[PDB]
């Protein structure tokens, strides 16, 4: 995600969406806040209308790279979790020094991370990984029962990525 | 010598650490020549295993200067450290960083330019935010002694870190700003630090903003008392009323550090109002954070307008934090409020402070009163004695009846310390029934400590009072229809006879013991025998022959073995 745009763009695109500047990295907000500004175009000041575009299109692609899997898929997957998907499975446990005989999105993604970090000399960041640790890292967020709800409000909207 | 180069490849087991990171002994035998062009290269690109091995390695290398040859070849150490300074694991990097700073003083000024500085720049410029957050911590230590032009380049690389694509690195940099500005020249703090500061001061992320406060403390102290208003003060003043409690929590928490760092007078003008708002914050854990610093904040108010501001400004606010709706806010105050006594004098502590001191004491909250009971240190020396008794009756009564066993433990535990500060006078009728309803307490350790209470009170009150008040009621237990309480009589006796002399143990205490040796419940009876033995060495030559001996003898003939045994041995322990 840090690799999507730079600081200068990062802030600009966030302004042209009228989105709290603090919310860079929240793809589903940004998406829908842009599908909401587009409702204020066509026969609708206008120099912004095509600027938000030039920016937003560059981010959509940068983010499309962020979601590419390692090695091109060589070396549970439909759309948005939905139904009674299980994001956590016990509050402190799945998160803290885990107790791990389960596969809740939290524990899955966490496995995904410590599995990828084996072959990546690279450090992973938000929207490359989507695990709690990477999220809680990106925004400035404290390990608490609030923070989990925020995280799994974006996961409930992301399409099965890294499974 | 022995197990060495072969042991560095095992299976990455924590059985290969005992001797691995004992590298201080390997390189001592490997010789200086080999260590350099062999051990170091090995240690650079062969082992990268677990967060426990690497963290021992990072530490070790920060002690390798006098072992790689001396300050002349410290530069050989850089690569295995610049490596470690990149591991995802925070605790490894931090050690690498910690070890890079130690060895960076061992470089000659020339060697810093040749080697250290390049290293910094490769970290700072890297793609890995891990590499970059490690760079932030290294500017301060190679700055003062590098060249005038190198300094100039170093401030760019920092400025760059301050405006990073990744929040992890802005946080990093923020948190290192005050350290770095301290080795800068003023010309540049005013010109180049302040803007950088200004920009983290006000940042989307409050995780970043939150860290501006300690830089604010740091930058303030640098700036002459006449620039603060132009450079530091608008940021600080804004941080105080910031949108996010996380940020405002900082200013309240680092407030007294902010007051001296900013100066006697600016405190008077900006800080005192800004401190009234924190005490009135809507978020609770901010109000508390400010309550904790109220008493320090007043001790450091200039030695003249103290009486004034404390009276006119602080006190009105305090009067509300007492009446606060949150337990953590009140309990904070209750543990500082009464350190205002040394500075308000004595006339005013009675005028205004006692209405306050006695408000908290009326509080139903257990934790609140404890702290107010606990602080009779600078209020014991200034205010009255009979005054306390008005609300110390309900205070000491409710605490001893708290639904939490371990609160009750506390006053029980306190009671022996309330003798050297309240005496024979305060302890009265409506308080000893208290000191004894604890012996009938369901929880156990309360009965334990409530018996410890009487032995601690005795050792503090001679052997006179006991016969008058206590013992009459301690024996008034030997009549309880519940055998567990009869039992308490004995345990209760067993400890007083310790410090009671021959007199009171033989006279009022003994006739009770013998009288219980007829208890229909067996448990009591063997405790009689056990109890006689603890009170053995205290009695008379003929009291033991007359009344004590003939009882054990009838106890031996028991249909309940337990009684005869503890009584058999009593007879053997005392002839
Ligand atoms: Zn789980
Ligand atoms: Zn992750």
Author numbering:
A (entry chain E): 1 to 44, 48 to 78, 85 to 172
B (entry chain A): 13 to 587
Sentences from the paper on this structure:
Specifically, SV40 small t antigen (ST) binds to and perturbs the function of the abundant protein phosphatase 2A (PP2A). PP2A is a family of heterotrimeric enzymes, composed of a structural A subunit, a catalytic C subunit, and one of several regulatory B subunits. SV40 ST consists of an N-terminal J domain and a C-terminal unique domain that contains two separate zinc-binding motifs. SV40 ST binds to the same region of PP2A as the regulatory subunit B56, which provides a structural explanation for the displacement of regulatory B subunits by SV40 ST.
We have determined the crystal structure of full-length SV40 ST in complex with the full-length Aα subunit of PP2A. Crystal structure of the complex was determined by a combination of molecular replacement, using the PP2A A subunit structure as the searching model, and single-wavelength anomalous dispersion of intrinsic zinc atoms in ST, and was refined at 3.1 Å resolution. Four complexes were found in each asymmetric unit. In each complex, the scaffolding A subunit contains 15 HEAT repeats that forms a horseshoe shape. The four A-ST complexes in the asymmetric unit have essentially the same structure, except HEAT repeats 11–15 that show substantial conformational variation (see below). ST contains an N-terminal J domain and a C-terminal unique domain. These two domains sit on the concave and convex sides of the ridge of the A subunit horseshoe structure, respectively, by interacting with intra-repeat loops of the Aα subunit HEAT repeats 3–7, which is also the binding site for B56γ1 in the A-B56γ1-C trimeric PP2A holoenzyme structure. The first zinc-binding site is positioned between two roughly parallel helices (α4 and α5) and the L5 loop, coordinated by four conserved cysteine residues (Cys103, Cys111, Cys113, and Cys116). The second zinc is located between two roughly perpendicular helices (α5 and α6) and coordinated by three conserved cysteines in the second cysteine cluster (Cys138, Cys140, and Cys143), with Cys140 and Cys143 from the N-terminal end of α6 and the conserved His122 from the middle of α5. The position of the indole ring of Trp140 is flipped between these two complex structures, mostly due to the intercalation of Pro132 of ST between Trp140 and Phe141 by forming a hydrophobic core. The linker between helices 2 and 3, which has been implicated in Hsp70 interaction, as well as the linker between J and unique domains (residues 72–86), is not visible in any of the four complexes in the asymmetric unit, suggesting structural flexibility of these two linkers in the A-ST complex.
